């Protein structure tokens, strides 16, 4: 398996652990094998192996950033196949159940905007800046993608309320103020119950982190808990103008296509029908 | 994997 | 008292948590409260409320460096640092708990939690080399000569006869030491503060936590804690990995590692801790 093919390297970082007693999360572009209180990144293909050396660059940049919670942070990085050993965020995520009561709601909220604060506060930063990419006009070339591998999939009248979804990328401005995390989905924010009420743990996956619009956290937040908790974030953070809405909204739109252009791309039938569920 | 993007 | 006191401010920070159930550690001027995830530093006067912002800042440098584990993580906002005063500092806490001396016995575990050990003071002595890292901590100048004044004035009182003769014994060589400004030196790298995920395996280093003291000084400080702690031969070992095995930096920590019996001493003088000042003037009566 991929545990007994990196016991050399297991038996190195985590010195006496059984490796059949681990698990290993496959995601898409590295290996993560869980251990008790870390991780342990590697590589798939050969080209996530040269671009780990900055990624585990980029996890330490964030290490140091004060977003009034927890981050992967970096323990270990070399060769044997690169290697990066992050700290292991403790918690569970949120079920949408708990936002029912509005107690929780009030915190779990206030800790959202804490966060997101801290991450466009990290955004001025030019140290920050410099450590973490910002591509130009990602939006452009993400309708130009989804031009080339979905509209051929797409039906007719999906085409149609696809290509209004791509032309309202383009009213968006290249705002590059705030750092972004890109995937900020309810399983990669950690929380601690069963103690008082949720306390954020810290937050984890940050392979899509760039500068950008912090409307795209915004919407997965929106995406994941839904309007009336959303509304409850924009208004304690105090970003609760037209605007803004009108981003996340357009934002909030790529996210079925974003599903089923990764998934069409890593040959995921599952995840590519129901990105394409509305669109044909 | 999905709808928040992944 | 502690509890009490603060319930109304813990209620906020720490919603529906019984207070009942948390645990104090007693610091010289803070007053940090020790909860499932995180720890809560309360200023003892407004003097110590002054210094909280700086404290931010030094924790926040501390998170960015590569000593290979965890440390307290600064849970407040950015601009708390450029405040004049605090009236809490919210901090992660450390997962773990502390190694005993009989676990080293095991020479294989020994050679895992020496090079662990090494990892860290490796990071923090090139640490020490970064100027934003010296520029952020602090560096007093003749400490040593200041230490065995602060030990003198303030220990000595408590000490018998016999003790005093002893303590001036360990003070003598102080004042020969040379002013080192090199590592980052945590001040108080007791077993106790470094903390171990012993769960699955051997034990593997989980963070450290108490950087109360943490300045830039002389690295042979937190070697010296080691030596008190686990005694000759694993410091040896931990010397030879490291590479700092050789008789100018021998010499220092046998020095230093006399009188940190005394540090312990005087930290719990200040901070009042009884129990601690009992266990660091034993001896000395
Ligand atoms: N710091 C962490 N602590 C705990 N689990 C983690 C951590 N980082 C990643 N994981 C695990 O990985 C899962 C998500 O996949 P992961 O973040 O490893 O993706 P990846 O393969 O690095 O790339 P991509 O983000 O493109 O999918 C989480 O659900 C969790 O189980």
Redesign the interface.
């Known amino acids: 398996g991929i545990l007994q093919a990196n016991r050399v390297l297991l038996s190195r970082l985590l010195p006496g652990v059984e490796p059949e007693g681990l698990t290993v999360r496959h995601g898409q572009f590295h290996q993560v094998v869980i251990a008790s209180d870390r991780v342990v990144c590697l590589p798939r293909t050969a080209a996530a192996a040269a671009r780990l050396p900055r990624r585990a660059a980029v996890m330490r940049v964030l290490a140091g950033l004060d977003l009034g919670c927890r981050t992967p942070r970096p323990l270990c990085e070399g060769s044997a196949l690169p290697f990066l050993v992050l700290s292991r965020v403790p918690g569970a995520p949120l079920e949408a159940d708990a936002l029912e009561d509005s107690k929780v709601a009030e915190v779990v909220a206030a800790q959202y905007v804490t966060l997101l604060s801290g991450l466009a506060s990290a955004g001025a930063d030019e140290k920050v800046r410099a450590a973490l990419p910002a591509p130009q006009g990602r939006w452009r070339q993400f309708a130009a993608d989804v031009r080339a591998e979905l509209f051929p999939l797409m039906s007719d009248g999906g085409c149609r309320q696809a290509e209004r979804e791509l032309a309202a990328l383009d009213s968006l401005p290249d705002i590059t103020e705030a750092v972004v995390h890109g995937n900020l989905g309810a399983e990669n924010v950690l929380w601690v119950r069963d103690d008082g009420l949720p306390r954020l743990s810290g937050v984890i996956d940050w392979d899509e982190v760039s500068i950008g619009d912090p409307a795209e956290d915004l919407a997965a937040i929106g995406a994941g808990y839904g309007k009336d908790f959303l509304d409850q974030v924009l208004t304690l953070g105090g970003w609760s103008d037209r605007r803004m809405a009108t981003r996340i909204a357009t934002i909030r739109a790529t996210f079925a296509l974003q599903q089923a252009l990764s998934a069409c791309r890593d040959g995921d039938e599952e995840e590519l029908a129901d990105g394409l569920t509305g669109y044909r | 994997?999905?709808x928040?993007?992944?």
């Open positions: 994997k999905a928040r993007a992944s």
